């Protein structure tokens, strides 16, 4: 059962796998039905947008720091900066996240700016509103209208400033300092108190 020069394979088909085969014959049908569901859902609540406004967050993981994406909801502090109560924000198409926090300033400012843009474009109706005004608005796509934008990479021209220590040496010294930080402080503690 092992034979001529060939890669060794790992085909995991030793269970009753044929009882658990899923063929997506319904790919096109589910596409069309999901499309009809979106259509009816939008028609039900027009001209209110279907999508709640979502914040912009950094992605975790040193592999994905450079990226920015849409988050779950705006933090309590971000909404507080614009003057919107959390329970009120949910009724005017603004997502709320009580779990997210604001340690830094950059994301906080970006989401405060998003909230201010949205609130400047917002038109709330009331009993004094006549159907002529309501019919004058189209159902805006909030995700497209307020998109997530990647901050641009630095480009263009700039003066060249050359430090005396090389960047490679800086990396080497940072690594060495981190590696021996624990034992150099222990050598320090045991020496100062004894002397």
């Amino acid at each position: 059962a092992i034979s001529k020069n060939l890669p060794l394979l790992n085909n995991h088909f030793r269970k009753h796998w044929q009882e658990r085969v899923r063929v997506h014959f319904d790919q096109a049908g589910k596409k069309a039905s999901r499309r009809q569901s979106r259509l009816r859902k939008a028609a039900k609540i027009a001209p209110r947008p279907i999508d709640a406004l979502r914040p912009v967050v950094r992605a975790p993981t040193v592999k994905y720091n450079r990226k920015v994406r849409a988050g779950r909801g705006f933090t309590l502090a971000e909404l507080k900066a614009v003057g919107i109560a959390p329970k009120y924000a949910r009724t005017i198409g603004i997502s709320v996240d009580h779990r997210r926090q604001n340690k830094s300033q950059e994301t906080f400012d970006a989401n405060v700016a998003r909230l201010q843009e949205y609130k400047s474009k917002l038109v709330i109706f009331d009993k004094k509103t006549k159907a002529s005004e309501v019919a004058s608005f189209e159902q805006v796509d909030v995700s497209a209208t307020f998109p997530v934008e990647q901050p641009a990479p630095e480009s263009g021209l700039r003066a060249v400033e050359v430090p005396e220590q090389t960047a490679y040496r800086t990396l080497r010294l940072a690594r060495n300092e981190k590696k021996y930080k624990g034992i150099r402080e222990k050598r320090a503690k045991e020496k100062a108190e004894a002397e």
Binding site: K15, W17, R20, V21, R22, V23, H24, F25, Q27
Partner: peptide, 11 residues
């Protein structure tokens, strides 16, 4: 277990 032991085939 059933999800992890289903062979998913697309068109």
């Amino acid at each position: 277990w059933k999800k992890h032991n289903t062979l998913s085939l697309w068109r």
